[PDB]
Paper text:
The asymmetric unit of the holoenzyme contains the catalytic dimeric molecule of the Nectria Tam. The conformations of the two subunits in the native structure are very close with rmsd of their Cα positions of only 0.13 Å over all residues. An MES buffer molecule was modelled with occupancy 0.8 in the active site of the native enzyme. The PLP cofactor in the holoenzyme structure is bound at the bottom of the active site pocket with the re side of the pyridine ring exposed to solvent and the si side resting on the side chain of Leu234. It is covalently bound to Lys179 via a Schiff base. The PLP phosphate group is anchored by a salt bridge to the side chain of Arg77 and H-bonds with the main chain nitrogen atoms of Ile237 and Thr238 and the side chain oxygens of Thr238 and Thr274. All amino acid residues of the Nectria TAm were modelled into the electron density of both structures along with the first two amino acids of the C-terminal His-tag.
In this paper we describe the substrate specificity for an (R)-specific ωTAm from Nectria haematococca and its three-dimensional structures in both the PLP and gabaculine-bound forms. The active site is formed by residues from both the N-terminal and the PLP binding domains of one subunit of the Nectria TAm and the N-terminal domain from the adjacent subunit. Thus the relative positioning of the small restrictive pocket and the large pocket gives the enzyme its (R)-enantioselectivity towards ω-amines.
Author numbering:
A (entry chain B), B (entry chain A): 1 to 322
């Protein structure tokens, strides 16, 4: 399984079973202070600082065909984000994983979006001593796999703009390697994209370089070489997988500063994210990207990315039997 | 009532009554989808985009001695913030005010922190059509008045640092005139201040100008003239009241770019915010601000700001009798 047709046929088959389910957890499940609740019924304390000041980090691993994909990479990134924020995982890792796998199994969901959120808790940083800020809260949930680009659009590629009315929050305000939900710039980018008849905004760093978009990294392909911005962006696990895939497929990939001009000169463009995978861009600022077709290197990356989902090195099988 | 002793003595007497109250709502009350809930019991949906992507705006008016202070100014600012964010107030203004005054009356709180939050609702911007993003959510709560600087400390002033490890989110990322809860830079500032043995961080715009701090505006006084940053900051209602007070007292106040160097040259420094009022700063970067005492112009502004709380132009009396 890794041509688009094969990957999507498997998804379609599993999705048909899931859409027919009468399981009250089939639309997702949340873990709230040690209790499982259907996702759409889940509630959190008003006073949680994750809401009061978006004072949190989070991470989103995924399950594909009943297999957790790169879960340890996501959990290590979450731990790193927590350390940077002076937060601590409220449960030890074996309990986190045990709980996630139980949630997935109970839901019956085979292709899942999985989110963990660690918040400061009920006491705000403002006016507190460090010792008063150690009771951090954890929220976790799973839901049916989410597509930032629908399967059918991945065949043709999507429409992007380089945002001109907004730029990325600079690392000296918020470190973008700490995964966070402070989406003020990204939401402005989304509205700009919609106003300009596109779906995906690419944000600059306000100094004429490409950064990332609204929840995805961006990779440019130029003369058989892949390029992706180093600074100013989340170091995506999908991006990590694209770096692995490039080397697997025998291409070079450069993680470095990418002048915005390079977007206009690119042979192929793709976006990457856990919620959707490898997402080609074939129109930029209302003009085709080269010939306006999904490029061959993109297709090689696409196939290898998905093939990784069935390899032990990158995934593990969840037991759904209860 | 306008000298510190008199204003704080009134608060202390009301507080003693409030602390002795057995009414569970004396600790605060929230409005959640048309229902009043004790504040610490209040819960919001996990899927609310106000939590999921901090996709919201808010505003914080106040009640002092049973009088709402400049409520219309806060509601107009909240309406202006909503318009900029493509949000709409979920209730008409007469219902908002009626609900807030009912909540205050039920709680018995005479000196109150009041918060209104308007979120995108349960549907995220990413992947939506404009018409799918109109079901916005409202949350409101009141709690006992919050002090960003305690009354006793206001006599002698607090310790600030100019932040060096973080700068303010630029307006080209997030417009700081839209009041918001995306505090990543402000929380970084709070941690830096605590690491450096201070309480209040002043953030620069990353281009050697003063902006604001973690939930307060900053006003410098130099040779009898007041100065406060124009760009890069929330246009505070307390700041508005300081502008009013300055003119009332016969001082000039300039709202303009304030090079960071001016902070070090200032005769007096104050912070201003709804949650605590007029808060003198007497130590900056471990050095006294001039003689290290609360200055005379600060004290004039202080008294006038508080006197405005009993004037009909700026306040209205809540009826607590049921
Ligand atoms: C999560 C995220 C991405 C993609 O990261 P993955 O680990 O590939 O899912 C890209 N940009 C931003 C801003 C993000 O928060
Ligand atoms: C609310 C706020 C202030 C102070 O505004 P007031 O209207 O005086 O309460 C200052 N800075 C920031 C960043 C704020 O959100």
């Amino acid at each position: 399984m890794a041509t688009m047709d094969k990957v999507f046929a498997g998804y379609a088959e599993r999705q048909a079973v899931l859409e027919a389910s009468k399981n009250p957890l089939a639309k997702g499940v949340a873990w709230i202070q040690g209790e499982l609740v259907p996702l759409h019924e889940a509630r959190i304390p008003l006073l949680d600082q994750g809401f009061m000041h978006s004072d949190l980090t989070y991470d989103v691993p995924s399950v594909w065909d009943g297999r957790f994909f790169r879960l340890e990479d996501h959990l290590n990134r979450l731990e790193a984000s927590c350390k940077k924020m002076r937060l601590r995982m409220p449960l030890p890792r074996e309990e986190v994983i045990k709980t996630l796998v139980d949630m997935v199994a109970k839901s019956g969901i085979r292709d899942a979006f999985v989110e963990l959120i660690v918040t400061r808790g009920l006491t705000g940083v403002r006016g507190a001593k460090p010792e008063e800020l150690l009771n951090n809260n954890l929220y976790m949930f799973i839901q049916p796999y989410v597509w930032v680009m629908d399967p059918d659009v991945q065949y043709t590629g999507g429409r992007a703009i380089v945002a001109r009315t907004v730029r990325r929050v600079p690392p000296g305000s918020i470190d973008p390697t700490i995964k966070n939900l402070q989406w003020g710039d990204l939401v402005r980018g989304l509205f700009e994209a919609n106003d300009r008849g596109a779906t995906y905004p690419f944000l600059t760093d306000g100094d004429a370089n490409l950064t990332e978009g609204s929840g995805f990294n961006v990779v440019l392909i130029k003369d058989g070489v892949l390029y992706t911005p180093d600074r100013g962006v989340l170091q995506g696990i999908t991006r990590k997988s694209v770096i692995d895939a490039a080397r697997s497929c025998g291409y070079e990939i450069r993680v470095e500063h990418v002048p915005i001009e390079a977007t206009y000169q690119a042979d192929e463009i793709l976006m990457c994210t856990t919620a959707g995978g490898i997402m080609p861009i074939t129109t930029l600022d209302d003009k085709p990207v080269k010939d306006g077709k999904v490029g061959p290197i993109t297709k090689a990356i696409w196939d290898r990315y998905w093939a990784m989902h069935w390899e032990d090195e990158f995934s593990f099988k969840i037991n759904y039997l209860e």
